[model samples]
Target chain A: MRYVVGHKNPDTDSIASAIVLAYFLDCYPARLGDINPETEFVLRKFGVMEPELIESAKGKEIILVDHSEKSQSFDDLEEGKLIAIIDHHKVGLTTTEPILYYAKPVGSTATVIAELYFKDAIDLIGGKKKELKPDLAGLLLSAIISDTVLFKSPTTTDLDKEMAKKLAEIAGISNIEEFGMEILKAKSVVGKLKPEEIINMDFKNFDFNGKKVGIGQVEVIDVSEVESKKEDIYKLLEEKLKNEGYDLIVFLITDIMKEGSEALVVGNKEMFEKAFNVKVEGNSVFLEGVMSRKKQVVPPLERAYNG
Target chain B: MRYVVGHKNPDTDSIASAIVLAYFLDCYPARLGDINPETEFVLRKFGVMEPELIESAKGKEIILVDHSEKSQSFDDLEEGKLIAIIDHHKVGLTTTEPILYYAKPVGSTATVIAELYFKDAIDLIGGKKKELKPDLAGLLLSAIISDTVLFKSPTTTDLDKEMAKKLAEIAGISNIEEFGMEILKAKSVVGKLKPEEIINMDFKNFDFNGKKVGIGQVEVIDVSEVESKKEDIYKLLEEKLKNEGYDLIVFLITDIMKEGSEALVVGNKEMFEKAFVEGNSVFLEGVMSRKKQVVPPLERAYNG
Candidate 1:
């Protein structure tokens, strides 16, 4: 059976896209790692079961969603027969054979998946347009809101907003803003979590000019909740930087209402300062209107390391 | 302005894809190198103008079609801003930002471009499809015939065959096989050309585990025409292997009727024999379709 999976540290878009695409392809949906609270809330609200946890992709027919980088994929991914990759990220992998590589510059993989469904429906049903199930539509709609932060992220595109509106109608959702707030509220209770859990919540690894960098983010309604545990979080970030052989580690505590982030850096504060042109005031800096880690954070840091 | 371009040593599919994609995007079509006889014949037959020759891609907004490898692209390609890539090959390029990368395991780039046209028409015109111009349809049909070897190559897919039929109807061409023969006949006259021109006509470069390799193919009606000039071609291959720092150089004289190829190898005969698992008979081998066959097996052996 072909296993459809997403990147590590599974977010709402990554897990939801895997489920929806696997349904379309008649394959099994799997997750590379544990899903975060946002994804858990989305799956529960949509009445979708959590995907099976996959440890290795050896000898399997793999179809990756939401990501294409080898750094974010399975360790033994090369051992598998990669049939297709449906993603919304920059291309970073090479293949021996030609495969279906459909990538677009959009906010979330969910947006692209919805577009594919509409296209396929047009092809098979001849414009009659077979609609997605209400529950499936809800899952995809929730994923779009989670990834774009309710259309506030820089990565959000018009196609994403359009797909979200169509999906909301199909799911019979009247108030999207109220539903989006509920999803965020389920994930905003960070005070009860341990320091290591908070640090590795939505982590991603990157390779820049042979430099190992790790960045993690946690979105919440109140930034003060994370600030109360700053000392413990900073200590854990420093330990992970050394133990994981990371040249730099960046942690973003994003406040949804404030529309800003408190970036905490470890192991290479100068690189962080150079990336954003902001001084690291005691290992942390407040950057207003910086919420997207992929669009705003990663690009500047990659340029700084390459420069 | 955004420039739509194909790979170096422009073939029919590469040039036709650049033109069609440029027409769709309202951009300018450019070619990285000189066109082969087959592409020239196609352009003349369809009354399509040849794309402008481009030396460098520095500071240009580039939309690459037909190929995605850095080795096949221009030398200064990285200096340009890559906007999109519409190809029918394996993914080999990366980007710092997300771009429109639409690649498929199709027969040719023309097939993918035709699919894109249909999809866009459906989006804008609400399924009351806007047909392509007759000349443009003929150019795209000729590209499909050239790349798939008139549906003889193993790379040919059902979508390619379907698109060819649709394009032939729009092009007002009744007999596709006859037209395909004419296209091949225009390219099969290899005896009148110099050995250097014959070798460099349709060449592609590849990097296998940091080993620079060059492979060239020339399809003809009869294999004896290229076999007669074997000595000069082999000498030129050796010269290029040494001067250009190529670890290996392979030349395929593919016979269209016989459906086989006479492969000439230089600089690394063992690697060639190991790639196909067939003994090289005096620096050459007669393998069925070592034309489209070389790309599939050679890289695996070299990288392995």
Candidate 2:
């Protein structure tokens, strides 16, 4: 069977992109892991069922999205045929054979798939331009809001805004201010989530010049709630560093309205200072206007590691 | 200046993808070396100018097509910013920073860029759907034929055939077999060229498991002429083995119309049979594709 899925710990875009790309590629939508609370909220609001979970991809045909790292993909991928990859992340994990790799430096994988839907409109029947189902449009729109921090993240592109507006019109949801805020509010609470859950919620692992690094981010309307559990989060980071044996681990406590973040970091404090251009005080540092990891975080960390 | 270019000894796809990708990405097209005979012929047939040559990419922002190996790219690449890469080959180099990398399992780099044009059509302002000029269509078609040996190579995919058909219609070339044969015949001569020139014409190097291997191929209508210069070619291959210290160097003299090849190999004779799936120093049968047949067999042999 042909399966379309996304990285582990499926986020809104990771789950929504499989559904959207499945429509164009004629594959069945699946999930790599359990859905996050925000994605569950979007599915319940949109009246769509959660996709089936997959454990092993052995001997299956797959199309991956939202991520391209080996640690984030399914295990036992050697027997599976990775037919294509549509991601917004850096390229890693050499396949045994050649495959279609479409990695654009965009804000989200949903933006890339949304553009493909419009681009492939001619191939769609009936000749109606900008043709997409309402459900898919809403899903793509929600994913765009989630990944871009409601157009507040620096990773948001002009095309992302254009596509989001087009999706909003198709989905017939005006007043993005209210709709986007609702989605963010559903996922903003940090007190109820475990320290491990908060770190693994939207965590992405990477390799920087032979050293393993992982960065987890969380956005909240009120940062004071997360700041109360700052010690617990740092303990989790230290645990991840010891368990996973990574060179470093960090957690960003971001205030969505304030547009500023406080980073709780562990391991190599000197390199951390050079990576973000900020001196570390205690175990945390305040990073002003540092919302996008692709733009504000990964680039500088890569420079520090390579330098 | 920001530039986009292809590998050295630029072939049709290498030259054409640079031109096409530069148009799409708003960068200037360049060449690492002078165009080969077949690439020059196709460029003249389509009335496109020869792109400018660059000796160094130091401190220049560039996008690469058709190749990603360190030896194949610029010499002083540590200072250059590789902003993007679109290749159909295996990945070999590691980048210091994140860049947009688009690779596919197609036969040619032109095939990848042509599909990108169709995929990015909606972004165009004028709303002219599927807008590719005849010059580009013809160039992309020629590249597919050149790389895939007129669709006879095992590397040719269904996408390559489909794109070739679409490009043929857009290019207004009704007879692809005849036109493709003419282009191949223009490039299929080996007598007048120098021995070193013949070896370096379409050479490629690979890191097979951990061993270094080099393979060069040239097409000819008649194999008798190249067979007479086999001794001279062997000397060059031996010199390359000593100077550059490649573990193996095999040169293929392919008969384009006849669809077979004669390989002149200079390496350990014990592994020659294991490398080509054939014995040493014999006129091979039906070895039509160097990209599909020779490189993969050598790679797997080194692994085994």
Candidate 3:
């Protein structure tokens, strides 16, 4: 009765969660698939690669993690025995059937995983009071720091900071500021990005107040590329959305550090004025300190949807 | 019951697949989740945002797309039948039974989906020759372009490009090359990507040859960052993979224009040497292409 363990789409949290979860279950050789190659490399680069990669099909105990029900398609392995699922993202449409899961409100799945480890003492379940294995702790720390935006994002909670500190202690690194910087540096190393790669990685398409628009984006650490590609994307969006005939478009240029977004409205001004009670500086909506896309932006947009 | 449609983690392909599939089913009010506002905003900006945002559990049929089965965790919607799924990622894990699914090895589910409009044509049952809706066709086009890397990826099949052209034509796009370039442009407009985002967003993590190594990366159209990031990633990998002591560490600095990833090896020089018989250039293995040819380099490298 052995099993494979891994998270959905194989993000860092997903991989980390799978690594530790598999460790806890002493998972078998045939019960897991990391799903993506990037997570595997990132984890391996960090020296925490799991053993084997087995994509699940009609006959195994699959315990889903990181992603909720809407995301995972467990049919090939669903024999009335898909176990538990753990995730932090909003559940999507696919996962509609009843199942067992632990859904938390934390921004990153690492927070949820760390909470589970702490609450159950799963790290020490093998009969040691020693903290989470240094690698596992390191993975959690990375996810927490990234998702919490180095513990300064609006999603950051006290629990996230405390758990991260606990993880740090176990990871054998105490200099939070320094290790933190190193982690960020490891991620934000400037020489690695192409200008075009910068522009296309993050994207979303939507109808803003009935106008079809999209925000192609990147989440930067210290450098910026949106402005560099603004003219490119601005023209690009206009031409691309022409077929859709979107009347107005708005693209938010969010500065992760300053916690604000310079909203680039491309479609129409009246739609902007009608949607949100905000003034535009040129074609830009200076959305000050805009951190919570939901707590701050969506409510007003929904109201504007009705207006 | 009506179905809510979307991908898991709802990346661009997932969202696009869901939208197109929904249109195929004549299902209105498809509910994609509101996971991250940034993700939602990006989807909107790309002109493929879900018309309705589902915050929590809701009533509906689920037409799953993009994400593989094992990746899906049922959460948002009220209990209902999981009618159909469109996925291109690795398959999933189920405990006892092989769940109902239709997974193909096509370059993109979008390609297969376009074929579905052909295979399961409404006209097959004596219906209109109207074919798939333009909106649905648009979603299929986006999916094919993204997954097939605009027909530039080696994983792409002849059927994929043919299907993509078909879908694009249905969507009323005259210049697919231009349209694809714009979509790719929006994707490449990086604001400030930390090494982590670069590693994560474009990364494809899985196991190869029984060793777990992820290909965390970003694809670049320019030559400069690709060259520089190669050196940078080599060093970063040394630090990141400190524990397993490594079998090999590698990165791909893809020159999109060249349609190939210059192989960056951070492992055994012996490993790197054996992989490419072409010539052992220092610090880089010029990969000339992205399809069946990609493996030859890696296979040579891994053997090294």
Candidate 4:
């Protein structure tokens, strides 16, 4: 059986996209890593079981969804047969043989898969037409909301909002704002997590000009919950640098309601100062109106490092 | 508009595959290089015009057919957008974006296209199902003839044979042997070609262990015709070696009737001698194909 999976450090969008694609294509859905808090909450709300977790993709014919980056996918994918790829990120992987690949520049992979489902079911859309299952539709809506930050993030597109509306109707949810906020509130309840779990909840590693940069961001309404554990976070960041050879480590504590972030950065202070063009205030910097890490946090650091 | 094209040197299979794929996909057909004799013959036999030639693919979206090697395609394809790829060769090209790619291991690229046409026209195949144009069917048949040597070469498969029978009927030809012989005869009549054109008509360049190696082959009934112009061919081969920095250049004058070849090899006679484990000479025999016979052995020697 073919296994359809998302990339490592899977967010809600990645996990949702993988399951949606597998449902449409009739394949086995597998998870590369443990589901984060937001993804777990969405799955629980929809009453869907979490995907089967696999250790390695050795000797498996895998189909990748949501990402195509080499660093983000399985290391042994080169040895396995990659039959299909449904991605929205820039291409960074190579294949020895041809495959069925679908890529677009949409804000969310869910949006891309939703469009495919619409196209595939176009003949039956009006009269006795089939729609996605209520649970799957709910998760798709949740994923778009999560990835787009409820349509407030800069990465949100018109297609995302349109699909969010259509999927909401299919999921029989009339109150979207109430439900979106509920999801965000569930994600913000991170105080119970230990410092390491808090950091690892949404951690992502990037190779920036031969330097390993780790950025972990979590959305929470209260800032003091994270501020109270600053020493432990800082100590773990030090361990990440010493053990993992991370040139830079940052923990972004984003306030969902305020739509701002208080970042605890550990790296070359001069580099951070040059990257954000802001002075370090007690190992933290409050950046106004910063929510999307892909759009706001990562590019500027890459530019500053290269510049 | 999407531009569909084949690889350089433009064999009959490449040209026919490009045209067939363009017709099915509703794209404009183009050629990477000028058509050779067999390609022109098949096109004229089918009464279809040669595809428009292109100089550069600077801003065009291309659909590659019949070839995937980067060396055989345009150099600027990396910058342009690649929409689809349909091929029957070893994959070596890389694209920055994902595309609809279909590849199969078959004797000829035309066989791959024919299978697509059959599959797409399945609903119309037997019961009011559509069939290929008589001209396209003829060219598809001609392409298999050119690539597989009328089902005699080692690369010929049962699928190639099956498609050849169906296409021959669709082309309204009753006798395949007579038609196959006619196609190869048109290819073998290379006496009037200039020395450079003869060497260039079927030339292929390979990167063998960081060395630029070029192999050119032409089929003919009489080997004496090519032997009569050995000096001119050798001089051009010498020029290719000096100007292009080719480490090895070879010209195989293959005899169609005898199913053997006489080779005129230039540059690094020691390398060629060791590569084949035979004496480097002005005449060689028992060579079958430039692909299976020569390239495989030469690559192994280069590796070993």
Question: How displaced is residue B227 in candidate 1, in Å?
Answer: 2.5
Candidate 4 per-residue lDDT, tens place, B1-304, comes to: 6788988888898888888777766678899898888778889988989999865777888888777666678878755677776666545454443455545556787886676566453211111334588888998889988998887776778878888998998899899899888888788766568898888888888767678888888887676787777678878888988899988888887887777777777887777888872443554455756766787667656756
Worst 10 residues of 3 chain B by lDDT: B91-100
Better of 1 and 4 by lDDT: 1
Q: Candidate 4 A-chain TM? A: 0.89
- Please give the DockQ score of every candidate, comma-separated: 0.58, 0.44, 0.01, 0.13
Which candidate should be chosen as best, given lDDT against the real structure? 1
Off by over 4 Å in 2: A121-131, A277-279, B75-78, B90-101, B115-131, B169-174, B263-285, B297-304
| Per-residue C-alpha lDDT of model 1 across residues B1-304, encoded as one tens digit per residue | 6888999988888899888777767679999999988888889988999999987888898888888788889787657778788888888776666777777787888887787675563232112344578888888899898888888877889989998998898888899999989988877975468899998888888887789989888888876777778788888889999999999888877777767677777778787778872432232333433324676688888989
When summed lDDT is taken over every stretch of 10 residues in candidate 4 chain A, the lowest stretch is A121-130
Q: Give the residue spans of candidate 3 off by over 4 A.
A: A1-11, A25-45, A50-64, A68-84, A94-96, A121-131, A186-192, A204-217, A221-225, A236-252, A264-276, A279-284, A292-307, B1-304
lDDT scores of the candidates, listed in order? 0.82, 0.78, 0.53, 0.75
**Which candidate, 2 or 3, has the higher lDDT?**
2
Which residues of candidate 1, in runs, are more than 4 Å off?
A120-130, A190-192, A268-288, A303-307, B119-130, B277-292
Q: Worst lDDT window (10 residues) for model 2 chain A? A: A121-130
**Ten contiguous residues with the weakest lDDT in model 4 chain B:** B121-130
- What is the descending lDDT order? 1, 2, 4, 3
| Candidate 2: tens digits of C-alpha lDDT, residues B244-290 | 98888788888876788888777765566776534436667888766
What's model 2's lDDT at B217?
A: 83
lDDT of 3 by residue, A1-307 (tens): 4453543234455667666666665664222333233344446645775556655445666666555332243435445345555555433323212233344546566776676566553422121333478877887777777556576656667778888888888777677677655544543432145544433333334443344544443344553545666666567656655765766555566566677766766666665666677766777666777654433454355345534
